[PDB]
Write a protein that binds this ligand. Structure first.
Ligand SMILES: COC(=O)c1c(N)[nH]c2ccccc12
Ligand SMILES: [Zn+2]
Length: 113
């Protein structure tokens, strides 16, 4: 019904940048694996298991192409990314544990703004 106000777009980018730039206690950038999806050639099981594949690259593109109409819309996709990581990977694994932290980082970034 109307274009995204520049204020909303700036917020979406500010929230996602907080998530992407987040470095843990050891000083490790947790988002590293999630920026890009795995290769269809090396990990075909992933594409067999995961209904809606989404990475941080696609999220940035959807903010850019005004695909998210609200912060709740952006949240649904960030929650999807993490759910996907947790669906494919073993509980307790580095990827699995990282997605749980990034869910928390997003919520903390959103709740601030
Ligand atoms: C086995 O690796 C994964 O689970 C993921 C990967 N390589 N890139 C992603 C982007 C988003 C969610 C999960 C993943
Ligand atoms: Zn599910």
């Amino acid at each position: 019904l109307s274009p995204n106000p520049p204020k909303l777009t700036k917020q979406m980018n500010a929230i996602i940048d907080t998530v992407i730039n987040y470095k843990d206690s050891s000083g490790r950038q947790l988002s590293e694996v999630f920026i890009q999806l795995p290769s269809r050639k090396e990990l075909p099981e992933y594409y067999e298991l995961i209904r809606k594949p989404v990475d941080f690259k696609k999220i940035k593109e959807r903010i850019r192409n005004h695909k998210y109409r609200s912060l709740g819309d952006l949240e649904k996709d960030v929650m999807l990314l993490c759910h996907n990581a947790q669906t494919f990977n073993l509980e307790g694994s580095q990827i699995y544990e990282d997605s749980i932290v990034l869910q928390s980082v997003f919520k903390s970034a959103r709740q601030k703004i």
